[PDB]
Design an enzyme around this catalytic site. Structure first.
Site, PDB file in Angstrom:
ATOM      1  CG  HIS F 202      -2.096  -0.985   0.998  1.00  0.00           C
ATOM      2  ND1 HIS F 202      -3.010  -1.259   1.997  1.00  0.00           N
ATOM      3  CD2 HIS F 202      -2.446  -1.764  -0.055  1.00  0.00           C
ATOM      4  CE1 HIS F 202      -3.871  -2.164   1.566  1.00  0.00           C
ATOM      5  NE2 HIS F 202      -3.552  -2.485   0.326  1.00  0.00           N
ATOM      6  CB  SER F 206      -1.826  -2.433  -7.848  1.00  0.00           C
ATOM      7  OG  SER F 206      -2.420  -3.156  -6.798  1.00  0.00           O
ATOM      8  CE  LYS F 228      -9.618  -7.947 -13.565  1.00  0.00           C
ATOM      9  NZ  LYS F 228     -10.245  -8.417 -14.834  1.00  0.00           N
ATOM     10  CG  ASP F 229     -10.107  -9.453  -6.679  1.00  0.00           C
ATOM     11  OD1 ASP F 229      -9.493  -8.919  -5.727  1.00  0.00           O
ATOM     12  OD2 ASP F 229      -9.700  -9.411  -7.867  1.00  0.00           O
ATOM     13  CD  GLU F 272       1.080 -34.342  -2.850  1.00  0.00           C
ATOM     14  OE1 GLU F 272       0.366 -33.799  -3.728  1.00  0.00           O
ATOM     15  OE2 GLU F 272       0.936 -35.536  -2.498  1.00  0.00           O
TER      16      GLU F 272
HETATM   17  C1  HEM Z   1       0.590 -16.386   1.173  1.00  0.00           C
HETATM   18  C2  HEM Z   1       1.158 -15.639   0.000  1.00  0.00           C
HETATM   19  C3  HEM Z   1       0.817 -14.382  -0.467  1.00  0.00           C
HETATM   20  C4  HEM Z   1      -0.300 -13.606  -0.214  1.00  0.00           C
HETATM   21  C5  HEM Z   1      -1.547 -13.888   0.669  1.00  0.00           C
HETATM   22  C6  HEM Z   1      -0.136 -12.491  -1.133  1.00  0.00           C
HETATM   23  C7  HEM Z   1      -1.095 -11.503  -1.296  1.00  0.00           C
HETATM   24  C8  HEM Z   1      -0.959 -10.404  -2.138  1.00  0.00           C
HETATM   25  C9  HEM Z   1      -2.047  -9.489  -2.432  1.00  0.00           C
HETATM   26  C10 HEM Z   1      -3.437  -9.512  -1.804  1.00  0.00           C
HETATM   27  C11 HEM Z   1      -1.580  -8.610  -3.374  1.00  0.00           C
HETATM   28  C12 HEM Z   1      -2.429  -7.592  -4.115  1.00  0.00           C
HETATM   29  C13 HEM Z   1      -3.197  -8.162  -5.332  1.00  0.00           C
HETATM   30  C14 HEM Z   1      -2.281  -8.697  -6.445  1.00  0.00           C
HETATM   31  O1  HEM Z   1      -1.590  -7.898  -7.111  1.00  0.00           O
HETATM   32  O2  HEM Z   1      -2.244  -9.921  -6.654  1.00  0.00           O
HETATM   33  C15 HEM Z   1      -0.173  -8.973  -3.564  1.00  0.00           C
HETATM   34  C16 HEM Z   1       0.678  -8.317  -4.394  1.00  0.00           C
HETATM   35  C17 HEM Z   1       2.014  -8.612  -4.579  1.00  0.00           C
HETATM   36  N1  HEM Z   1       2.600  -9.711  -4.000  1.00  0.00           N
HETATM   37 FE1  HEM Z   1       1.838 -11.128  -2.898  1.00  0.00          FE
HETATM   38  N2  HEM Z   1       1.090 -12.498  -1.820  1.00  0.00           N
HETATM   39  C18 HEM Z   1       1.641 -13.679  -1.461  1.00  0.00           C
HETATM   40  C19 HEM Z   1       2.879 -14.120  -1.893  1.00  0.00           C
HETATM   41  C20 HEM Z   1       3.742 -13.404  -2.647  1.00  0.00           C
HETATM   42  C21 HEM Z   1       4.968 -13.919  -3.217  1.00  0.00           C
HETATM   43  C22 HEM Z   1       5.548 -15.310  -3.024  1.00  0.00           C
HETATM   44  C23 HEM Z   1       5.541 -12.901  -3.901  1.00  0.00           C
HETATM   45  C24 HEM Z   1       6.760 -12.847  -4.598  1.00  0.00           C
HETATM   46  C25 HEM Z   1       7.873 -13.821  -4.443  1.00  0.00           C
HETATM   47  C26 HEM Z   1       4.590 -11.824  -3.790  1.00  0.00           C
HETATM   48  C27 HEM Z   1       4.761 -10.649  -4.409  1.00  0.00           C
HETATM   49  C28 HEM Z   1       3.865  -9.636  -4.477  1.00  0.00           C
HETATM   50  C29 HEM Z   1       4.168  -8.382  -5.150  1.00  0.00           C
HETATM   51  C30 HEM Z   1       5.549  -8.003  -5.725  1.00  0.00           C
HETATM   52  C31 HEM Z   1       2.993  -7.741  -5.311  1.00  0.00           C
HETATM   53  C32 HEM Z   1       2.831  -6.550  -6.265  1.00  0.00           C
HETATM   54  C33 HEM Z   1       1.795  -6.740  -7.364  1.00  0.00           C
HETATM   55  C34 HEM Z   1       1.819  -5.632  -8.426  1.00  0.00           C
HETATM   56  O3  HEM Z   1       2.734  -5.630  -9.281  1.00  0.00           O
HETATM   57  O4  HEM Z   1       0.923  -4.752  -8.413  1.00  0.00           O
HETATM   58  N3  HEM Z   1       3.479 -12.143  -3.069  1.00  0.00           N
HETATM   59  N4  HEM Z   1       0.189 -10.112  -2.870  1.00  0.00           N
HETATM   60  C1  LIG Z   2       7.723 -34.740   4.576  1.00  0.00           C
HETATM   61  O1  LIG Z   2       7.935 -34.861   3.167  1.00  0.00           O
HETATM   62  N1  LIG Z   2       6.966 -34.179   2.502  1.00  0.00           N
HETATM   63  C2  LIG Z   2       6.965 -34.173   1.172  1.00  0.00           C
HETATM   64  C3  LIG Z   2       5.875 -33.413   0.416  1.00  0.00           C
HETATM   65  O2  LIG Z   2       5.706 -33.631  -0.783  1.00  0.00           O
HETATM   66  O3  LIG Z   2       5.085 -32.534   1.091  1.00  0.00           O
HETATM   67  C4  LIG Z   2       4.138 -31.908   0.221  1.00  0.00           C
HETATM   68  C5  LIG Z   2       7.917 -34.890   0.459  1.00  0.00           C
HETATM   69  C6  LIG Z   2       7.586 -36.130  -0.076  1.00  0.00           C
HETATM   70  C7  LIG Z   2       8.532 -36.859  -0.787  1.00  0.00           C
HETATM   71  C8  LIG Z   2       9.812 -36.340  -0.963  1.00  0.00           C
HETATM   72  C9  LIG Z   2      10.142 -35.101  -0.427  1.00  0.00           C
HETATM   73  C10 LIG Z   2       9.198 -34.374   0.290  1.00  0.00           C
HETATM   74  C11 LIG Z   2       9.725 -33.080   0.913  1.00  0.00           C
HETATM   75  O4  LIG Z   2       9.728 -31.839   0.203  1.00  0.00           O
HETATM   76  N2  LIG Z   2      10.697 -31.723  -0.743  1.00  0.00           N
HETATM   77  C12 LIG Z   2      11.446 -30.686  -1.100  1.00  0.00           C
HETATM   78  C13 LIG Z   2      12.379 -31.123  -2.229  1.00  0.00           C
HETATM   79  C14 LIG Z   2      11.532 -29.367  -0.658  1.00  0.00           C
HETATM   80  C15 LIG Z   2      12.108 -28.407  -1.482  1.00  0.00           C
HETATM   81  C16 LIG Z   2      12.256 -27.098  -1.039  1.00  0.00           C
HETATM   82  C17 LIG Z   2      11.823 -26.753   0.236  1.00  0.00           C
HETATM   83  C18 LIG Z   2      11.242 -27.705   1.067  1.00  0.00           C
HETATM   84  C19 LIG Z   2      10.739 -27.309   2.461  1.00  0.00           C
HETATM   85  F1  LIG Z   2      11.311 -28.062   3.398  1.00  0.00           F
HETATM   86  F2  LIG Z   2       9.421 -27.483   2.508  1.00  0.00           F
HETATM   87  F3  LIG Z   2      11.011 -26.034   2.726  1.00  0.00           F
HETATM   88  C20 LIG Z   2      11.098 -29.015   0.614  1.00  0.00           C
END
Ligand code: HEM
Ligand SMILES: CO/N=C(/C(=O)OC)c1ccccc1CO/N=C(/C)c1cccc(C(F)(F)F)c1
Ligand SMILES: CCCCCCCC/C=C\CCCCCCCC(=O)OC[C@H](COP(=O)(O)OCCN)OC(=O)CCCCCCC/C=C\CCCCCCCC
Ligand SMILES: CCCCCCCC/C=C\CCCCCCCC(=O)OC[C@H](COP(=O)(O)OCCN)OC(=O)CCCCCCC/C=C\CCCCCCCC
Ligand code: HEC
Ligand code: HEC
Ligand code: HEM
Ligand code: HEM
Ligand code: HEM
Ligand SMILES: CO/N=C(/C(=O)OC)c1ccccc1CO/N=C(/C)c1cccc(C(F)(F)F)c1
Ligand SMILES: CCCCCCCCO[C@@H]1O[C@H](CO)[C@@H](O)[C@H](O)[C@H]1O
Ligand SMILES: CCCCCCCCO[C@@H]1O[C@H](CO)[C@@H](O)[C@H](O)[C@H]1O
Ligand SMILES: CCCCCCCCO[C@@H]1O[C@H](CO)[C@@H](O)[C@H](O)[C@H]1O
Ligand SMILES: CCCCCCCCO[C@@H]1O[C@H](CO)[C@@H](O)[C@H](O)[C@H]1O
Ligand SMILES: CCCCCCCCO[C@@H]1O[C@H](CO)[C@@H](O)[C@H](O)[C@H]1O
Ligand code: FES
Lengths: 379, 241, 80, 147, 241, 380
Positions: F202, F206, F228-229, F272
């Site tokens: 915020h 966005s 939209k969402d 998985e």
């Molecule tokens: C439990 C995971 C997450 C939640 C609940 C979450 C939620 C949100 C929400 C509600 C927005 C605003 C709507 C949208 O643009 O989609 C947002 C934006 C964003 N999120 Fe996340 N997010 C998550 C994970 C991540 C991850 C893994 C990344 C990047 C590695 C990330 C990067 C961003 C960024 C950079 C924005 C900016 C969007 C734009 O360009 O306007 N988020 N996120």
């Molecule tokens: C407890 O293991 N849970 C497994 C799974 O599938 O959960 C959905 C699983 C199953 C078979 C082989 C490896 C994994 C373990 O996960 N494997 C990898 C390779 C991994 C890779 C990056 C990070 C992490 C962690 F630690 F969650 F952060 C885990």
């Protein structure tokens, strides 16, 4: 912005609530309980998690899992002690926090007050479900006694109860859902605590004289961070002294016995911090009436903001209210005491007296005396 | 049936907040339990290894555990079988289940003693008064067959026949096995069984106090130091007036 | 307060109709679809290629892995 | 959609199948000899079903206990004649009365006395109320379904 | 070495997303299990009550459970004892523990069948292919004594002798008990044992789709309706130029 | 105070400044719908999670059957279990599209929103990892074993860290009970961090698909995006439910319908689908230590993205070379996912290293390089 303490979207938050936060210059030790409550909460959650990592929510293993923790886990016995006794430190602190609020009219900050009431209710629910986990005799029977009260609610009675137990009595399905609830609620408390402090910051702290402190405010740090750290060690000493030298002082020996549904303990009574309410519960012989009385004994707190008649905020300059206040405090020790006693003469009659005076003082006397005092000031 | 006799407070050597258990007394208490009480009383939460470094030698503990046959298994053919005990085994149960226990004690159930001194108000003072308090019922009181009179037991009619008497055993350390001496030892042992952390807990208590004293003083000075600015502060009202 | 401090803007006029005066999904065939096609067209050669390559590599590797499980008669031609 | 999802999640908290499977017990009236008391397991606690011979709806159904400690009127909440069905749990401290003895020929709680007549009513003893009588029915005489 | 024969896809009557299990087939399947497989295979997660309203009458299920003696207890003297079964009992285990099971199957362990069709790739198509797929090993392959050749089993040497053959039992519903008919029925039964919710799940799926189709369209219109304001919006640049 | 109570109130004000009067670009596409889905996804996992937790027993001797008891006896327990297990996948599909969108549109230039994002991903993975172990089936146990044993490869502190994590000498009951506690706990940290995520967000508001300032054209979040969402929610929720209701076990390993047995190693220990890409990279470096670092790097690499932006433009909308590189990378990921599900043999081994290598190359060398190259082609 010059310093990164104000510009940064996070540090800014840390700064506006713990560093440059304007605080009255004259708040006393009674204002030290908010922070203790917070720290207390962080500690319960911490020791809780540590215990949870060795517990097993099953009627057939609960008791022994707690025992395995105390006997085999490195410092498990210490963690168990700190958690159990910490629950009491938590309540002692919460009661003084509330007391301070009633005495100083902190309740006039309505929202801060109401969230506060909610924190107390949540804290109780937390301790109730927590207590059941070790699955000892008082664990089981306390669970039974209290949950059976709801079958008294006409219509949705037997239903709400059998829904809560997940069966026909307190049994394994109850234990497992109680563990989930116990693990969960503390996090709601932490959440609500933030809301609590958010409403609070709208106005800032009240002070013992009850007059505007805008004329004299000082930064929370170092004044209160130091005052609070000191207050922490001052309280923490008796806490540890109790937990390390007299571990079982507050607990019931009956809980060192695995729960048995075929053996009712002679005296089913709660931990100290619930005794006052347990007394009020039993004061009304009539399942339904007693339940309402119990409920009202705590819900009554939501009315305090509407029973303020004084023209002054605190009780600092209201001697008639002051005695009424301490009368009330004594009223509470009496209820606490009646709560730990069997239901017999003279405890029974004393109990109803105490229950009745409790509600009278808060509902009738406080507002009345306040009005009376207004006249004596020619107001 | 109303009225109960509350035990007196004996001066145990482990009662002081800073006083540990007399391990020599605990060792004898173990012997009592092992040779007398263990006949009907289980102590499920203690294992032979727990004795090591507390009351017994590792060699001693290993021998103690081997005097017992434990049921292990299943084997290849899915059969249960006996084997000599290891220090990892827990003190053997006198009976398979409570039903069998009552069956052998006139429907009375001798409870597990692992936490007995904490499961009873009075603790060791209670257990001690009970063991050494058997006597004839007062006038007007009749004890139903099978029960024994004890003023210290609620209801005063206990299902446990006096378990100990003088010389009922011999302490291999050469202590005079009088009845009260025995009760005293087994009670000290029971305290330890209920809370092995006892000594460490108190040693920690000591450290907690010293540090608490030191730290609180130090912090008090610091709070005072900072606040001195406001405490000594002086102000004046100077209107143009 | 985020509405009113955003941008310095001058001389732009905009016209809009209430939603009740207009159609929700207008000109599907005259405007919508043509554009959908337009959008697909302008992207297909950027997206498709690597996905197609992925598929190939996948097919190869899957078939190659099975081929290596089969037996080569050339290892038994003189086992009499 | 919401109403259904909520209903489902809410009901996931009520008694599961394994539990309901032990909800009730069905006892065959026509296999319980006269005078002889039989006890079954129902909801973890003992369930008493005694067949009153002839000297029970009389010897212990004509009693003249003026002031009763519990308003026990068979026409209030009971049913069958030679049939008495009680929850084998003393209302004092949850002990199980015994049918062999019973000062008043009924049941005796070996915990603190509590004597219950043939109808299962507290006579001589500390326990306040009378052994609880659980829900039942006879939609099939040669069978009763408690619970 | 890494070679394996994958089963074919049979057209089960419960394969369609909207097609429930043929309960008549599940009922016969139960018979097969009860009279054939239950001799060596345990089905720990199913109880007689589970049959009620699915394949059997409540009276029928109560009779089926009573055909079994279960070990209850302890009694008064803390003794175990037998008793006739109730519909709350689970299908009886053929062996006390795995060790005893292998002991009676040449060191081979017949697995619990409660989740078999989900614990194996191929599910019922696999279990069916296996049951009806025994045959002689191809040239060059020798099955060690005790094992039986099955092309569908990994390694192809299974420890289970062909369990079923024509007329090995009689269906009391009068269906011709051919080997493939039997396998088909027990496989359908196995599907149900693995997921009793099967029918309810699909009935729900149907409702989820209709509501999903309805609600999605509705919401699409609403989104469009609101956005129409921006979609059709027109603008112009009019500088004082 | 102020006219409407939506702005004055200390709480509604918060609800209003983030879900009603919140200025949103007028042109954000469906790719911006994943944030809200992630949030809803999170609330749902937590909800179904609690419902399952109320019938679970964290003990090696009861875990498997407690889950079975839930599915067989609890009213709709089978449904809740399905929704929870499958919801984990909906969660990851959503999180990967969320990230993708970010890479393609330069959302990462919002550094703090991005870094908290990377933290959300890591926490989500740990959550699913510990969650997976709870049913205590064969893949539960062996997956736990395989992965945790990787740390005994860390120098000096290795063996310690591992035996500390297990609470013994192997994955056993003590591991299970602490994993339950962690699984119950982490989701709440995710919720917490999610708030911080949106808070940083915020500060800027966005970004949008053209990558240019949208101050000239902003619209209130409500009703435009709330609608939209909600639409986006039902559109995704349909396939989710279709899968969970018609093909419940499509994504799961049958090996998990067998109680864990430390004396029987499954033939193909694989995770998985959402972890496969990482498992492939793990196995690409034959050398316990190197593979572990490679695995770690495969996700930590996300923290470098903000520093590898060389383009003069924010998004890739007008950068065709970057666009193909982008889809090359996507395909690269499907390949790793595929390699992750295959046994470690030829030709999967060589293909695997190729894919692992190209993965890091594309993000570390090619993207920044092509960006610079493109700057020249615009005479910049
Ligand atoms: C439990 C995971 C997450 C939640 C609940 C979450 C939620 C949100 C929400 C509600 C927005 C605003 C709507 C949208 O643009 O989609 C947002 C934006 C964003 N999120 Fe996340 N997010 C998550 C994970 C991540 C991850 C893994 C990344 C990047 C590695 C990330 C990067 C961003 C960024 C950079 C924005 C900016 C969007 C734009 O360009 O306007 N988020 N996120
Ligand atoms: C407890 O293991 N849970 C497994 C799974 O599938 O959960 C959905 C699983 C199953 C078979 C082989 C490896 C994994 C373990 O996960 N494997 C990898 C390779 C991994 C890779 C990056 C990070 C992490 C962690 F630690 F969650 F952060 C885990
Ligand atoms: C609630 C649950 C009940 C449990 C039992 C209650 C706790 C019992 C412990 C007793 C409390 C110990 C406090 C003794 C301290 C005595 C003392 O200092 O009093 C005098 C002093 C004078 O202050 P001023 O008028 O501002 O003077 C300024 C100029 N010099 O008064 C105070 O310190 C203010 C009193 C606040 C503390 C109240 C603590 C008691 C707590 C009980 C909670 C009761 C409230 C309602 C709860 C209902 C649920
Ligand atoms: C990561 C874990 C790996 C798991 C597998 C990855 C997921 C595989 C599923 C495939 C994704 C389906 C998307 C197909 C949509 C095709 C499409 O519409 O492309 C064209 C279209 C054109 O947009 P503009 O240039 O703005 O045009 C404006 C003028 N008209 O491009 C887009 O929509 C933008 C692409 C964003 C979505 C990316 C989704 C893929 C997700 C993968 C994550 C990869 C990133 C790095 C993760 C490392 C860990
Ligand atoms: C013959 C078996 C037997 C022996 C030997 C015996 N006890 Fe007991 N003990 C019992 C029985 C039976 C009870 C149950 C009494 C009751 O509840 O009526 C009992 C109960 C107890 C209780 C108290 C129960 C209560 O409710 O307060 C204690 C404490 C106790 N025994 C201690 C000991 C100790 C210590 C010894 C060894 C010195 C010992 N017993 C040896 C049979 C025995
Ligand atoms: C004589 C005991 C016995 C009978 C009867 C029997 N089985 Fe088996 N079954 C076994 C044994 C032993 C195994 C172990 C095979 C192995 O792992 O080598 C087995 C294994 C299986 C397997 C496959 C194991 C795998 O790993 O894929 C299935 C499925 C199976 N049996 C189904 C059945 C069915 C259905 C029937 C009844 C029609 C049945 N069995 C009757 C002995 C029997
Ligand atoms: C977990 C429980 C609680 C936490 C963590 C908490 C925390 C705090 C904190 C940190 C403060 C500021 C310092 C202070 O004045 O003590 C505060 C103030 C306050 N709290 Fe609480 N509180 C809790 C429970 C409650 C309860 C139960 C009430 C009332 C029923 C309450 C009423 C108030 C009020 C009215 C103030 C104003 C203080 C003033 O007059 O300046 N709080 N609380
Ligand atoms: C609001 C903070 C908390 C309160 C007031 C509280 C209170 C209690 C109480 C009264 C007991 C019974 C102690 C006993 O006599 O044995 C208990 C037990 C327990 N609590 Fe908490 N608890 C809190 C937080 C937590 C948390 C956050 C967890 C972990 C996620 C937790 C885990 C446990 C466990 C496992 C036990 C069982 C072991 C034991 O009884 O010592 N608690 N708690
Ligand atoms: C961040 C959200 C969460 C994720 C991504 C997640 C993921 C998982 C996964 C992958 C499994 C294994 C499912 C299976 O194949 O059986 C699982 C199981 C489980 N989760 Fe969660 N979970 C989440 C939150 C929660 C929460 C908040 C709780 C409850 C406090 C919870 C409780 C459980 C329980 C009890 C199981 C075991 C039963 C089962 O396996 O179905 N989960 N979770
Ligand atoms: C599960 O029971 N836990 C007990 C306990 O001591 O936990 C610390 C206990 C013990 C004995 C008797 C009654 C109680 C139950 O607590 N008693 C009362 C009387 C009570 C009173 C008010 C509110 C609440 C509640 F529900 F937590 F919110 C409970
Ligand atoms: O109250 C305070 O109010 C501040 C302003 O809303 C927040 O940033 C803090 O986190 C909160 O504790
Ligand atoms: C007395 O024994 C104590 O037991 C403790 C177990 O927690 C150890 O940590 C101490 O070092 C040891 O002295
Ligand atoms: C208020 C602050 C109190 C902190 C007290 C710290 C004292 C803890 O000291 C502990 O004593 C035990 C017994 O000797 C040792 O076994 C532990 O290793 C040691 O950490
Ligand atoms: C188990 O029975 C189920 O009960 C449901 C009703 O709750 C029905 O909708 C399902 O079709 C039925 O199979
Ligand atoms: C997108 C929203 C989808 C919601 C679909 C709700 C339909 C669930 O409907 C369910 O059908 C079952 C089978 O008849 C019944 O047994 C359940 O009680 C009922 O709640
Ligand atoms: S419990 Fe029956 S007489 Fe006391």
């Amino acid at each position: 912005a010059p310093n990164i303490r104000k510009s940064h979207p996070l540090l800014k938050m840390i700064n506006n609530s713990l560093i440059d936060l304007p605080a009255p210059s004259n708040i006393s030790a009674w204002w030290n309980f908010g922070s203790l409550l917070a720290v207390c909460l962080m500690t319960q959650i911490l020791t809780g998690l540590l215990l949870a990592m060795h517990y097993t929510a099953d009627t057939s293993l609960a008791f022994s899992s707690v025992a395995h923790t105390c006997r085999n886990v490195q410092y498990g016995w210490l963690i168990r002690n700190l958690h159990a006794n910490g629950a009491s430190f938590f309540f002692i602190c919460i009661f003084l926090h509330i007391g301070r609020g009633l005495y100083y009219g902190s309740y006039l900050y309505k929202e801060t007050w109401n969230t506060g009431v909610i924190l107390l209710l949540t804290l109780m629910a937390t301790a109730f479900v927590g207590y059941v986990l070790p699955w000892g005799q008082m664990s089981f029977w306390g669970a039974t006694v209290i949950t059976n009260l709801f079958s008294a609610i006409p219509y949705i009675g037997h239903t709400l109860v059998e829904w809560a137990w997940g069966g026909f009595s307190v049994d394994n399905p109850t234990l497992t859902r109680f563990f989930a609830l116990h693990f969960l609620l503390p996090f709601a408390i932490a959440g609500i605590t933030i809301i609590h402090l958010t409403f609070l910051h709208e106005s800032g702290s009240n002070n013992p004289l009850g007059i505007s402190s805008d004329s004299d405010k000082i930064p929370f740090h170092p004044y209160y961070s130091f005052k609070d750290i000191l207050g922490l060690t001052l309280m923490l000493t008796p806490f540890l002294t109790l937990a390390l030298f007299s571990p079982n002082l507050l607990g019931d020996p009956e809980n060192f016995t695995p729960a048995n549904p075929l053996v009712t303990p002679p005296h089913i009574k709660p931990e100290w911090y619930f005794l006052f309410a347990y007394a009020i519960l039993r004061s009304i012989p009539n399942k339904l009436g007693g339940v309402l009385a119990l409920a009202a004994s705590v819900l009554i707190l939501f009315l305090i903001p509407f029973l303020h008649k004084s023209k002054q905020r605190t009780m600092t300059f209201r001697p008639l209210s002051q005695t009424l206040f301490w009368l009330l405090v004594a009223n509470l020790l009496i209820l606490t005491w009646i709560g730990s006693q069997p239901v017999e003469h003279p405890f029974i009659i004393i109990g109803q007296m105490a229950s009745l005076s409790y509600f009278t003082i808060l509902l009738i006397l406080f507002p009345t005396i306040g009005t009376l005092e207004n006249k004596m000031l020619n107001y | 049936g109303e009225l109960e006799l509350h035990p007196p407070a004996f001066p145990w050597s482990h009662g002081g907040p800073l006083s540990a258990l007399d391990h020599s007394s605990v060792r004898r208490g173990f012997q009592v339990y092992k040779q007398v009480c263990s006949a009907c009383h289980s102590m499920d939460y203690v294992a032979f290894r727990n004795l090591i470094g507390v009351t017994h030698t590792e060699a001693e503990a290993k021998a103690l555990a081997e005097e017992v046959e434990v049921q292990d298994g299943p084997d290849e053919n899915g059969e249960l079988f006996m084997r000599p005990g290891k220090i990892s085994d827990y003190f053997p149960k006198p009976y398979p289940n409570p039903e069998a226990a009552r069956a052998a004690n006139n429907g009375a159930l001798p409870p597990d003693l692992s936490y007995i001194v904490n499961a009873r108000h009075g603790g060791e003072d209670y257990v001690f008064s009970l063991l050494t308090g058997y006597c004839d019922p007062p006038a007007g009181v009749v004890v139903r067959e099978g029960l024994h009179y004890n003023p210290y037991f609620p209801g005063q009619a206990i299902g446990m026949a006096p378990p100990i008497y003088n010389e009922i055993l011999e302490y291999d350390d050469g202590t005079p096995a009088t009845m009260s001496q025995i009760a005293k030892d087994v009670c000290t042992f029971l305290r330890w069984a209920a809370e092995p952390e006892h000594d460490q807990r108190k040693r920690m208590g000591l450290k907690m106090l010293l540090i608490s004293a030191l730290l609180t003083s130090l912090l008090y000075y610091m709070k005072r130091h900072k606040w001195s600015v406001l405490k000594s502060r002086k102000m004046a009202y100077r209107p143009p007036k | 307060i985020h509405f009113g401090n955003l941008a310095r803007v001058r001389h732009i006029i905009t016209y809009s109709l209430s939603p009740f005066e207009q159609r929700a999904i207008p000109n599907i065939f005259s405007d919508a679809l043509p554009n959908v096609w337009r959008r697909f067209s302008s992207q297909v050669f950027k997206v498709a290629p690597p996905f197609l390559g992925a598929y190939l590599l996948y097919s190869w590797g899957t078939q190659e892995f099975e081929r290596l499980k089969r037996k080569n008669p050339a290892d038994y031609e003189n086992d009499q | 959609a919401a109403k259904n999802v909520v209903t489902q999640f809410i009901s996931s908290l009520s008694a599961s199948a394994d539990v309901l499977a032990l909800s009730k017990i069905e006892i065959k009236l026509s296999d319980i000899p006269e005078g002889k008391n039989v006890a079954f397991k129902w909801r973890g606690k003992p369930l008493f079903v005694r067949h009153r011979t002839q000297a029970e709806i009389n010897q212990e159904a004509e009693v003249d206990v003026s002031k009763l400690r519990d308003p026990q009127h068979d026409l209030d909440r009971v049913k069958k004649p030679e049939w008495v069905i009680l929850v084998g749990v003393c209302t004092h401290l949850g002990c199980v009365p015994i049918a062999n003895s019973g000062d008043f020929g009924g049941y005796y709680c070996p915990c603190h006395g509590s004597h219950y007549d043939a109808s299962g009513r507290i006579r001589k003893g500390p326990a306040p109320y009378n052994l609880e009588v659980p829900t039942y029915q006879f939609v099939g005489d040669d069978l009763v379904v408690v619970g």
